[PDB]
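User: Here's a protein and a ligand (sodium ion). What would the complex look like?
Assistant: Let me lay out the input and then the predicted complex.
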Amino acid sequence: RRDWENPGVTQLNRLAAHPPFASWRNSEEARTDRPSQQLRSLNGEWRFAWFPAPEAVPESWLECDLPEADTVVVPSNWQMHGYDAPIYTNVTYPITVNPPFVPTENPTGCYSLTFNVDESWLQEGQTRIIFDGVNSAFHLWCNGRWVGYGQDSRLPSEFDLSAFLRAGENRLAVMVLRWSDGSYLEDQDMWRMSGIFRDVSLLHKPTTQISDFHVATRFNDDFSRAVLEAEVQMCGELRDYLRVTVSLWQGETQVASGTAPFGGEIIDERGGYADRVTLRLNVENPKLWSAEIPNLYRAVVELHTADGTLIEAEACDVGFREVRIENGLLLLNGKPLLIRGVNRHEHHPLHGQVMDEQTMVQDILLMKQNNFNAVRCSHYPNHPLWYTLCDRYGLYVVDEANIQTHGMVPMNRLTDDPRWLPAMSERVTRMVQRDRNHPSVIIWSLGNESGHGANHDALYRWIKSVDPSRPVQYEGGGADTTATDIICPMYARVDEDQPFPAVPKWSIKKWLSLPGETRPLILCEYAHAMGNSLGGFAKYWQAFRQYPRLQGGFVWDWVDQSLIKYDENGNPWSAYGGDFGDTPNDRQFCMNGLVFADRTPHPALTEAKHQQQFFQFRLSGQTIEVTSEYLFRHSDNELLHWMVALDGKPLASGEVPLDVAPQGKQLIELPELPQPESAGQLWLTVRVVQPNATAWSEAGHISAWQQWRLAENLSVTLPAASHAIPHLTTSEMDFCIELGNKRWQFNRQSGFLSQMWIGDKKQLLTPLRDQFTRAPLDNDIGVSEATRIDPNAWVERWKAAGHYQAEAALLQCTADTLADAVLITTAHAWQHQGKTLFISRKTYRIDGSGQMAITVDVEVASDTPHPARIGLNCQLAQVAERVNWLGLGPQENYPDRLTAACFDRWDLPLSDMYTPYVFPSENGLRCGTRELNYGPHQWRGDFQFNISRYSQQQLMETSHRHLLHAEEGTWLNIDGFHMGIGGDDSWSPSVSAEFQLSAGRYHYQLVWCQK
Amino acid sequence: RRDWENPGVTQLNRLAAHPPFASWRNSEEARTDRPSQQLRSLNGEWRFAWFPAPEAVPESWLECDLPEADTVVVPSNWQMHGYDAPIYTNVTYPITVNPPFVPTENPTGCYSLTFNVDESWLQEGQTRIIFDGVNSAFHLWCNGRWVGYGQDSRLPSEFDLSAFLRAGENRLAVMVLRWSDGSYLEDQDMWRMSGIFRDVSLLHKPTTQISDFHVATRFNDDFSRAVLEAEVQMCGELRDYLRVTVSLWQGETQVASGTAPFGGEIIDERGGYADRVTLRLNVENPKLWSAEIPNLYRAVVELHTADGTLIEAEACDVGFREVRIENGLLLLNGKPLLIRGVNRHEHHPLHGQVMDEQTMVQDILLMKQNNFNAVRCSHYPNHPLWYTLCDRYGLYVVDEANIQTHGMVPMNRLTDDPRWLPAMSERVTRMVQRDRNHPSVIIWSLGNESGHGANHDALYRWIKSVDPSRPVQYEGGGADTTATDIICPMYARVDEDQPFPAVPKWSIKKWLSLPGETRPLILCEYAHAMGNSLGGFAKYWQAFRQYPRLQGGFVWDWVDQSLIKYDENGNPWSAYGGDFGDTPNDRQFCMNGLVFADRTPHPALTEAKHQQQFFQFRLSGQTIEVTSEYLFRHSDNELLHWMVALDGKPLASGEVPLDVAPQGKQLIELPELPQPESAGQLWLTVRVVQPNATAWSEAGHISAWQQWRLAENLSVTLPAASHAIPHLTTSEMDFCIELGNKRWQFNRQSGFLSQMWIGDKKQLLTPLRDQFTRAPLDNDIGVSEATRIDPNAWVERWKAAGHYQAEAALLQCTADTLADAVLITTAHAWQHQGKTLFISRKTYRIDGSGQMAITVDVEVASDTPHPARIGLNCQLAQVAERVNWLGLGPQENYPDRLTAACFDRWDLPLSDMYTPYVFPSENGLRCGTRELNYGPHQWRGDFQFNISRYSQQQLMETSHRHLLHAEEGTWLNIDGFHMGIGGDDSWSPSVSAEFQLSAGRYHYQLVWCQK
Ligand SMILES: [Mg+2]
Ligand SMILES: [Mg+2]
Ligand SMILES: [Mg+2]
Ligand SMILES: [Mg+2]
Ligand code: NA
Ligand code: NA
Ligand code: NA
Ligand code: NA
Ligand code: NA
Ligand code: NA
Ligand code: NA
Ligand code: NA
């Protein structure tokens, strides 16, 4: 029959979808969410054999274990055990595009298990097997007898095994296909993996059973009264003595209870549902659920007889919350949401797409600790535990149907085809049937990047009909179609229009006010966090705060999709697409996360945390205004610490308790600050600290911060006249300057400081030279490759103009003796094929104090692409343990991503001054720096710098971070000016005009001396 | 696999649905709609073997013909050849209700055909088979090899046979199943038949082919400009030299043309459809399509090369029209429709559910001739030729999906179940894909009586998305749900509310103005035409005309669903449900047609014609005002004939051409009419006559009529005093009156006129007695049965009150002699077990002129159910050929169904005074009669009458019309008063209060004399 090549067959003998069941036979166990004896896990050691096609599977495998088979752990993806390569591709399909057919060579995973069943399970009731996730399709046998078939990798497939099992030993056989017609709806850009990758379980239900239940909560106008409505469905024989009781619990306190026999209200001419009942419980002053305060109740559904004998019980966590769009605003409990969201794929660097509790909790804690309140299930229903954890920890969830057809041409080719409506309907309907009782799910999504087809309109309406409690969104076909309640674009910019034909990405501010438009706007994807990125992140949040109908968005994305590989020595290294031998591939485009695969933060995470802060600050005189952005909670775990420092030297500090109502304001008057005697700039830093630990954070957690410049006292005092006078020694090749045992050598051929000496010790391994380039970031490169060059990309514009190739031509090199100093004057021109790109004019002034004052004035040809940087570089002989600077830090920061960084005195190990981006680039920059200290050296001015053991050349020429080698000495890059990093997306230039180096003429000055 | 018990499997290897194809290889043949050699009919003689189950089918049938098999005509229903019994059932399922399972005893029809295929068909291109209608499911084999599977009895199933066929002799094997999971969606109230009941064909297409095309017509504000947009899709290899030309023709004149290569506009980020193109043709002053003037163009779609070589051509008829709902009104071409509709099942008394052109054309002609402009496809897509004929003759069509689940408890059990959404979607989507190019289709329907479920809402939105040119309607779940653009109730009454729980049927006038309601109301079913019915029909049309938003409805229904059976002598008779040995059955509830199965009209059809007239009339003095109800056409085939008569005697007549604009008025001034010499009532009759023949009518066709009373001259002149004096003779048992040769005998024990003589000739066979009962109409009975009594039904109320058993008790019987007359005075009481139901007081006055004046005064007990009639009856000895009367006629007419009848002198054969309803009842009544003549007898007064060879007793006791026997003499029923017939529905009392005999006291008077 080849059911895996037929979209008319998505399942065979599969049971109906339903909310999580456990079939408790004790009500109290249901109430407390204790493990149920009737729900058994079949996870663990299974038998597995790989085959090139389903035709290669020997008939004997159905009857008994194959000797060639291995013992593997389930759940698992079989690629993670090295049976075949995990394929990765971005836009194009991993297979030949000819629907509904798949390749004849279809990797087949043969799973089997020998397991025990209690006789009590078979003497009464129903025994079913539950596969929470099988990728992408499977056939099931039990004791040699065929049971059924299933598709959709991301939802549970359940089969009745009551007629198949025997008491004692039984054997399952599961034939898993890598490719099916299901694969055409599963084109998410990620590692293409297969197998039994989610839990396998056995569930025993009584013959007379709860088959479905739906929980709704309606509210009065001010949410002081609620009605919990619970619809319960049954299967089996209806009897007059049957009853349903629904009880509601707040912790250990029962708040309400209701009992009724079966028999629903009349709904049409033929009567009503005899096999259903709806219970209604009044709740006075309900404790409302939100991400801020995840108040939960417990609902217990008891199926029983009139005399009080329990048949079975089911239960769920209930969150009293209302989600509605009104007057163009998404409201939760009557209040407008501001979505601090992120997209999160299910990814583990070691276990692939297998999810576990520890990884999930780790993600949620890190998200909430970094001021995220929302998550998008990109792009499929998640492991069932995810929702439980989001209910309890408090996160807003967008639950998304497992439908992506991004490789189709055009994108809507399947989704506009009525012949694919059945298969698509199943992916939407079975998701809703499973997850509808979770309070954390506030929005349904119809899938991702599948264009806009009629099937979307149909399924949009289906959800609106069955579940009016949640808005429906969908981005395909231009982000504002008739299939979405929310304008939900991907990578629409703040101020800049991108007017693509048919599917424009308008400025988000402009999009809101288009003729006739009234809906809220929440970006389903924004701020592409690929490599050194999140440039311009602050621009989004300023817009979100200013515009009521701009209600936030979901960052792309949470975690790098890298996998661990082992070299010749067996050492682990982070691998991306193309490293597993898969071709065609899309290189490092799978790594766009705010955290590394091991959940170590990227520098961008702190920028996200700062901008997503829940308290806003203003300073007027001595008064600090604190405004709460919380909608529900008072600031009952918040203390404001303030500190005033003169150039990093602390002068005054204090702490004030925060007492701010939701949306409220608190004024804090600072005490009289003493005027410092010394020159310099006073800086005020405030931080919000959480004194008490929570479910999601430790005691002392910092949740918010802000800085201001206070009084500045400019230095007017002249330094004391120096006793020593520097001497100029002139040879043919060199201008030399001597001061005691110190020496500065300027090569007259090159026109650069070629060496410095302190006694017999040399300071430089490479001369001090101008630098106008950086090792290209992911955003500089875009989609440009060696075989497919994108001439628009920043790196290619730099390469074509000769920026990386330009040679310094000496125009001038003179030396003059002043009264108290030696003045070296130089001029250079960087040319490429007759074209002067840059001109650098310098003076070097060395006086008796041992200070070298360097003045730099650069010309940049108006018609050359704006340079990545304007600065100097050298390789220092010194290798020191610590780096000490007065400037923005402590973390890496760039001009369009420095809001999170604070001005202060910072001291870090040299290793912290390098960011280990998997794909090496310009990294570790610190801006707004007024003083830098490294070993004996001190640099003073107003500059940007990075400092590491890796040259810009090595970073540029090395593909992976694990292939990098520490060079001799220390490479220093000191920039007068540095270009923004961008990141609005990673496939087109995204650096905003104000962060491009376009002024034409630039000036900076430095002082180099010994500390 | 048992695919016929799986709602997830509705087809295997079935090709996509599409508009009618013929694959012409000649453009002129496509333009002219001539037969195509590439479309071959496989209709004719096939081989057939019946089996009790699919398991009972021998494996040799796949390869070789069975000797036990018979030769049958295809298309056919196998129940019509007597293989098994055609089951009839209304609300209940004919099978055990256990979805998706069907009975193990599942009658299986094995069809096979051996046929020739020419090598040329297989050498190149694609050969497909098309089964237009197979009931209910089937597997297909070709030359022993399995091809595919299909469900949905009412749409074509198509399969590619290109790889299966061989040059020369080929054999098809079709295993048809009576029951499948498809049956759960096919629970229409009709005969349950099966087999290959629509056409079978072979279609040859090239490999590079037109695979789909859609035609839209859009207009400017005043319909003076139009754009025809034609989307053309292809299959096969795309080449740059490929072209599509769409040409539009008005007869033999090409009005527009457009040519383009393949490649549609960009629709998303992935581009557009390379295999599609859209052509736009401008049309100035288009001739518009309507039911009034069915103007058609021909669109020809040519697939060709750039150098001019035709590959293939497809085509369709195009009607330029716009259907939209605006401000609560359904509009066609800017004008509000008034739907004069009827429901039409596909039924033939000899061929069952097999349809032919002759029958279809016969139905359409009769419909249009009786002023119908609309048809509802109750309850499934029709034979493809139906739409062609409606396009060409001009009828508005509601195309309805083959979805009915009336037997489900509750009615929406399947339609609210997402697991049934795939199967339901196919029934909707494949209908739209087939029929979307037909201009006659103006409204889509989601099916019938399937409650309201979320699946309806999903499919409603699907249609709205893919085809915004047509409104969507659906009655289920209360007629006004979110799945309907039109309030479309079944059997909602005009003034009377029926407030059923959950699904009330409001008064249609009330329904429109319910809080928040804005939609149009068109009844999907109304005026149930079961037996002697359509009482109160005029009430609907008065309402339709008065209320803008009441836009008509569809009568239930067109044709009686009786079948032909034969007796011992081979004489045919009409059989209903239960006559074919099927049980449980719903008796004569299959016969609700306006015409008999052979298309002979019921009397009700003339009432429909008159009420649905397109011209309205008013009279003011001498002025006749004629108002056109046409929306588009001038009255360019209409002449007004007027006649003035005095008690049936013509005094003046004339004719005036009608020249009335649509919606316009014409005033016609009648000439000076001379005052008559005689006493009596002048009557004016007008009729609209069509002088010219049309496509749908003959010359002289009468389309409209109306009558008014003019001047009346009351008779004041005393008749010449009669010389003869009647004489009274008294015995103990009789009062006898003598006048020359004439004798009247009144029995003194009974109190009735027992005999009359003229010479030796006796006039009566049964005495003249009061009658208060009628042989019960289908409406009087409702759903009441002998085993299941409905005590609310009129017949049961009458029975329980003793009306049929009432025995006359004599209270008074006297004889008086007047100067010139004999006076007989009588009084009777009708009592049932001590209770007096009626009292009748009479006088009989016989004077010297031979005239017997009868005065009747009746008392009806206020607490007895209102009587069916208040009259007299007798069995006359005479059998005469003709019946002549001055009153309403010529056809049968009742108090609530007499608007179509005209007051004139009528003369018919006796047999025309009996209406042969298949289920015998009171019939043949004529109302408002002032004079009746039969043989030697004349009756004068103001009465209702019927006259036949059948007593009320025989009509009541005889089940079928073919079992009736002419009794001796002639049964005369003369009523002072007669109850209404009702018919708003036929399962509850429907006789309106104004037509019930509730006055308590009644008076009428008759004169009986010799003519
Ligand atoms: Mg399949
Ligand atoms: Mg700041
Ligand atoms: Mg089926
Ligand atoms: Mg009239
Ligand atoms: Na906002
Ligand atoms: Na990605
Ligand atoms: Na606090
Ligand atoms: Na690199
Ligand atoms: Na109307
Ligand atoms: Na019927
Ligand atoms: Na005329
Ligand atoms: Na009868």
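Summary: Residues B 189, 589-590, 592 surround sodium ion (ligand 10) (CB under 6 Å).
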